[PDB]
Design a protein around this ligand. Sequence first.
Ligand SMILES: O=c1[nH]c(=O)c2nn[nH]c2[nH]1
Ligand SMILES: O=c1[nH]c(=O)c2nn[nH]c2[nH]1
Ligand SMILES: O=c1[nH]c(=O)c2nn[nH]c2[nH]1
Ligand SMILES: O=c1[nH]c(=O)c2nn[nH]c2[nH]1
Ligand SMILES: [Ar]
Ligand SMILES: [Ar]
Ligand SMILES: [Ar]
Ligand SMILES: [Ar]
Ligand code: NA
Ligand code: NA
Ligand code: NA
Ligand code: NA
Lengths: 295, 295, 295, 295
Amino acid sequence: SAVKAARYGKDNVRVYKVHKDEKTGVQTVYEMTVCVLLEGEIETSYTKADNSVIVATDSIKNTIYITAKQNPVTPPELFGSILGTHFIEKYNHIHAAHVNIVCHRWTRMDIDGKPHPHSFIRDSEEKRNVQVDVVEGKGIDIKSSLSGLTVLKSTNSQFWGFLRDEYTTLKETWDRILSTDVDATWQWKNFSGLQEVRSHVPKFDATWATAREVTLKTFAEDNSASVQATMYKMAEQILARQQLIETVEYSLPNKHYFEIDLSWHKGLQNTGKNAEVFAPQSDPNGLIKCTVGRS
Amino acid sequence: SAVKAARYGKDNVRVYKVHKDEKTGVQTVYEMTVCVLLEGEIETSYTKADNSVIVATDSIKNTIYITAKQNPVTPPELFGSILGTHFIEKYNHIHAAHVNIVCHRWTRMDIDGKPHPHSFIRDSEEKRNVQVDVVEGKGIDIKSSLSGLTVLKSTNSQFWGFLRDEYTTLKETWDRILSTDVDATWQWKNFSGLQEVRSHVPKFDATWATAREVTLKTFAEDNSASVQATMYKMAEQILARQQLIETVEYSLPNKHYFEIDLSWHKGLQNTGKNAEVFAPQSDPNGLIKCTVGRS
Amino acid sequence: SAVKAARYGKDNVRVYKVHKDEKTGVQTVYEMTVCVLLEGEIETSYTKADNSVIVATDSIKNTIYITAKQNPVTPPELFGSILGTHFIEKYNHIHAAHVNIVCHRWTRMDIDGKPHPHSFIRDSEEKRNVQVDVVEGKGIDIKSSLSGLTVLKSTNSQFWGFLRDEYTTLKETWDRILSTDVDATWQWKNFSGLQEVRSHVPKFDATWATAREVTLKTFAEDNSASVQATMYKMAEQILARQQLIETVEYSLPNKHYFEIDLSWHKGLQNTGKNAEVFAPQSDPNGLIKCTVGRS
Amino acid sequence: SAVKAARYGKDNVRVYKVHKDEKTGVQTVYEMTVCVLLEGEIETSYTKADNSVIVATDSIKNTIYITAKQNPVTPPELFGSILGTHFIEKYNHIHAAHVNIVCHRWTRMDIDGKPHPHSFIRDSEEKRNVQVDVVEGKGIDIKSSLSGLTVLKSTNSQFWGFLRDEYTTLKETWDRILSTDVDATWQWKNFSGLQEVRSHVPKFDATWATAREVTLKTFAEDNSASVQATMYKMAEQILARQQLIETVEYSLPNKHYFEIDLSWHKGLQNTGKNAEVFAPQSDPNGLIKCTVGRS
Ligand SMILES: O=c1[nH]c(=O)c2nn[nH]c2[nH]1
Ligand SMILES: O=c1[nH]c(=O)c2nn[nH]c2[nH]1
Ligand SMILES: O=c1[nH]c(=O)c2nn[nH]c2[nH]1
Ligand SMILES: O=c1[nH]c(=O)c2nn[nH]c2[nH]1
Ligand SMILES: [Ar]
Ligand SMILES: [Ar]
Ligand SMILES: [Ar]
Ligand SMILES: [Ar]
Ligand code: NA
Ligand code: NA
Ligand code: NA
Ligand code: NA
């Protein structure tokens, strides 16, 4: 037997950082969960019990906190690139670092219509994520994403004209509920190293904001023919607005809300145009994916 | 052996309702999870296999959907009172109905600064809940609550002057992070029946909004001496603003964020006034409760 | 406003203890999650910012570990009674301690048919729990429970003869699937103090084992007329086998498995006697409770 | 913009099947969660709102139940291969089917030392999984796995001799707790089609049992030098016992249990050889992966 692939590190490292403006007294908080996995010349830890090649996972944990103390933690594309580069520069035998960051929302409170200097609310479990792969001699690959964005529209969704055969019971419809949790990922052009990531720092927050805005507006305004057709419109617009993105990937569950026939009870009308009360289905769910790139 | 207490019914009943304004084209959605448990003269179903006294849990489920079709589902205090009253009026041998409603957020989307007519976002897992106990000859007891409201302040929290003995390691502090998930419950005066609940319908949404606003403003503005002292200030203000509330109960976890001593690494200063990077603790957590009533 | 009720302490305190037999080399592990809440003369911490009455929740955490170091942690009824008694004896102004323990399974591994001296498996998320209330001048109240015991029987469950009215769609059945998660609680006679709890130590593990065995055998062997009727048979037998129990409470969800009509597809027969494939329902669920005590 | 990749289908499809032996009266239950995603000539559903190429996800759901009615559901490698092959044979424009099955434990109850004919218990959240990729003209790729197998050993784990630098605080140890959740995947040789999968049916359950037994025995008996070294020993033995496996992948969290220094309290000794009480850490955790193949 031989080691074909190996990676190891520390997962679920919770980090909070506060920034304190001395002039204004305004405080800004950042909270993330970080995972770092390393690869390189480490096969002998597996095959020969040679721990000399192991950077302890405990040390990786320490490194994350020290890196967050000495560097900006925002945008997360930059922090992830700094953290990944650290490992491949510090350790001769480590050739790749894989950094995953989940950013948690701490939104400044408005009290009596003014922004509060040091109070925050978690407005939704929506996350902003990055995946940074730093590979010796192959630069920095960044995938940025938003996840956990849960939306519903109560009309202006259709689904008709699909394949009908002896397995099909689904009725065509010209008016349904559409609800999903949005997972959207945009993959940047490969960066040569940290200097090039730093040169594009302003684009990261701006592209996240664009991706979010395009997703919400397209969902709200499209007279949707299908999840497939609406999601492609979202992806097309993101690629048009940021030339440094190579691909956009969406993964959307179709969270079903079923009509309830109440006609057995005193002829109560609750289907088609009369539908008011619906049964949200926990499972099963549709799952629709696509990856959109340039011509 | 004897049956001392028995209750049965249906839990986890997901319900969606849409309201469609024909004039404006504006649609409003409501989504809840409902539990109904019944009590009454049902001991023989347990002791003698006498199913004739059982209103099937499946029928309770049907009743929830039929009730939501024929009545307003907001405010939830009213819907719960209608649903509970139905069971004790329809079934001679059922003497109490216990209704629990969890309301899920569907917040109308703003697209290009205008409210969208039929598109919604789940802005946070905060819930609005009711517990309604309808008891034949004892009226309607309503407990209203908000839960899942997660906040953090990065300064203006202290904790000093506590009991110190041979079990104590905790250092006194004049500046810490305070973070909690708020669970707040206000218990209404007993209502004689549905007519009296209907007479107070406007107070329900208004009192929920007051409870929320008082909680957020007090948290943000109090130079907190302890969770105990801040929560009592919240409860005192709610009781002052709504005379029909008898008691206010708060249950607050103290979600700890620990300083990280980095002085072992090149004398890096990250404690006391120099603290920037902290380790959020998943567990354990403080848990602080109190119930506040009138003199 | 006045404080009507207050309690505070530490939740989610994870504890592991190992016992090492020096003679045999056999090691035994215990892992629990502990919550301690205190009550007493503490209102001024809420009303006056008087922290002098607060035993810090951090100190409660330390006390749990010190108590586990110096005492047996099994049976959990005994450990909980020791921990609760500590607080009301050590602190003059603390008059009640509320201890909740969840015990996690670590079952010794069998390797090549022999018990392994120091290796363990988590065989199921079933828990053994205690609730201990130690109240100055009112002794020690213990509720023991098992929870998370998930079972299914594929036949020998019926449900017919229930109330039928204009809300009823459910068909009577003489053969269905019955599946539940068992939550069973037995409440001990009040104990005068720690000496009396110690005098009954052997009864705690024995009664837990009896409750488990009665639950499994009754579920498996009863030709069930309803969840109500089967659960009462369980409770009756536990009360008959342990005279120091006052009450037995069961809380059982009815986790539904629905027949799937496939007759639309090439007349495939999958209902009634021909039913082979079923759709497990995540929600809603029936919820059936009862408390059984002595004549 | 162009569609680079697309797949869609139905997730979270819960299925139960019962087998009834007419001779013995013995019943055997199977419960799984199934996901099917399709790929093929479907880009126009995304780009042109052409639903004619869409096999509705609702129809995929129906197909899963019909397939389970007409075929064995065990071993899951066989059921997954039948289900995937169905789609690429029935639909000219579908060229790949991706089937994921999670099998849930329903273990027959022993009542009074005899196996019960129709009663089952969920003994642990351990799963048996398959991933089946059926690709027109490229055969059937099967990955089998077990997941959710949670173990702990209280001694006979070491970790010393790792890299020490200015980021390192971790002390070397010759005696620690090792606890993990095992995720183990074995990848079969490519199969030409369903006839070849059928020819190897007995190997699937046997290889699952071997993988489980090797994992448990190696964990229990290895005087572990590291997670890395123990996991490689597991992988080496599976590859030696089943020639039709190409690779074995393990993913192991290192769930930390920390010593608690109690020496501040009356000089209590609870570290090194005196350690009895430990604090289980929820996060962070080590994460160690490797893929082992043949020379
Ligand atoms: O088994 C281990 N492997 C590692 O890579 C490691 N790092 N810290 N502790 C560890 N334990
Ligand atoms: O066992 C049962 N008890 C009930 O109360 C019930 N209601 N519907 N189905 C049921 N099954
Ligand atoms: O606000 C607080 N209240 C308490 O009771 C406490 N105990 N430790 N820390 C604490 N913080
Ligand atoms: O938008 C949809 N896409 C699909 O592929 C589908 N299948 N069933 N319903 C559906 N809705
Ligand atoms: Ar969509
Ligand atoms: Ar607070
Ligand atoms: Ar039962
Ligand atoms: Ar291991
Ligand atoms: Na390197
Ligand atoms: Na009545
Ligand atoms: Na006392
Ligand atoms: Na095909």
